[PDB]
């Protein structure tokens, strides 16, 4: 009745600065008690889609390791964060595996990530040579080469920085404002689980 390892989630959320999506973080959580109920005490969600495990029973269902990812993406691209869904932000920056498991929180932050002149502190990948194998990151910025001539180590005609910045401003309408997205990935194997819900007991 003395719940003590409330898994740290008030920090995976509310961090006040989500990193851009070209280079997403990856926080591994284990060895605590994860009462996901607190998650439902933020703003109404543009998307709460759970794919492997039914969402209401998130208390009692147990785990070995959980993985928390977070980034910021243009609104009408939220749907691209779902297994086997092609498109830019899902084939160049964050590729789910089509045997994925876990849930996908996605809420709105229009008040928190715009400036009257316009933010540019979120850059996403726009060019590469081929798509990504699932669950992989490429923070590197090699000046992309398009034409038959080399770029000589810098940008040039038909050789441009693969990263490109968002423009976030308060005047932008719904569907092009920054939605903050977080993805919880699950997995089960032969290891000390120790990831279960809080016992409902009586003193």
């Amino acid at each position, epitope marked *: 009745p003395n719940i003590t390892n409330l898994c740290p989630f008030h920090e995976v959320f509310n961090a006040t600065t989500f990193a851009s999506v070209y280079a997403w973080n990856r926080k591994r959580i284990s060895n605590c008690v994860a009462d996901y109920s607190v998650i439902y005490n933020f703003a109404p969600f543009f998307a709460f889609k759970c794919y492997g495990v039914s969402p209401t029973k998130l208390n009692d269902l147990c785990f070995t390791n959980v993985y928390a990812d977070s980034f910021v993406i*243009r609104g009408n691209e939220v749907s691209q964060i779902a297994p086997g869904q092609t498109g*830019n932000i899902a*084939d*160049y920056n964050y590729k789910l595996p089509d045997d994925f498991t876990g849930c996908v929180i996605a809420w709105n932050s229009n008040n928190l990530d715009s400036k009257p002149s*316009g933010n540019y502190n979120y850059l996403y990948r*726009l*060019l*590469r040579k081929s798509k990504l194998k699932p669950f992989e990151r490429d923070i590197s910025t090699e000046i*992309y080469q*398009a034409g038959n001539k080399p770029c000589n180590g810098v940008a040039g*005609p*038909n050789c*441009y920085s*693969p990263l*490109q910045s968002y*423009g976030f*401003r308060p*005047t*932008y*309408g719904v*569907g*092009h404002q920054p939605y903050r997205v977080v993805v919880l990935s699950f997995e089960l194997l032969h290891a000390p689980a120790t990831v279960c819900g809080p016992k409902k007991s009586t003193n």
Partner: antibody
Amino acid sequence: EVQLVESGAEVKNPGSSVKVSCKASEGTFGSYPIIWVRQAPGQGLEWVGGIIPILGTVIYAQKFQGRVTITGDTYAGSAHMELSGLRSEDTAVFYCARGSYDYGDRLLNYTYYAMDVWGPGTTVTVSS
Amino acid sequence: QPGLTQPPSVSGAPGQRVTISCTGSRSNIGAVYAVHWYQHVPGAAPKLLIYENNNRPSGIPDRFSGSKSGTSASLVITGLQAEDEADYLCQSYDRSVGVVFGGGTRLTVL
């Protein structure tokens, strides 16, 4: 949804120039690049200009090469295009359209695939 | 216009399968290039119907279709209706000069 607001009609004389915009809703062209096409009266269509606004790499049709220039903003972007030396054979309608692919595999190859959402077009007329 | 010529217009019987042509060179379509089918409302903004020579954009019910063959391509409507009375258009790239557009057929129904 995406809507492409654009200015009203233009009336002027031979040899002059006209500048018209492609006002886009919610302002973020967001790497969706813009194609500028003419509607000749009683005839088909003729592509004129093409601009990928974030990268800023711009191409023009050989017929009007050096006769027309295009610019764009892409953040509350309202990409502008102006045609110079208007004459009798230039009175037409102006359309601007997107490409809807916005990533490198086919956006530097842009002018191949498609143009998704178009605009009402604006009539430009020579005086004669 | 070094464009994509096709017959000017075809009248419309009600509710059938009608085909429309788009003929060009091998040097501008045949080599690798793709054709593209637009629907145009006279006085309004046109609409896409077919891209990548074969695929079918969403929002278009299966009435429309089309394909390519050798040195030409074509489009087809099943179950003709009066709302389809409109301009039709086919475009492609041009090794010769950038992008090339066809005449446009004024599909009419009587």
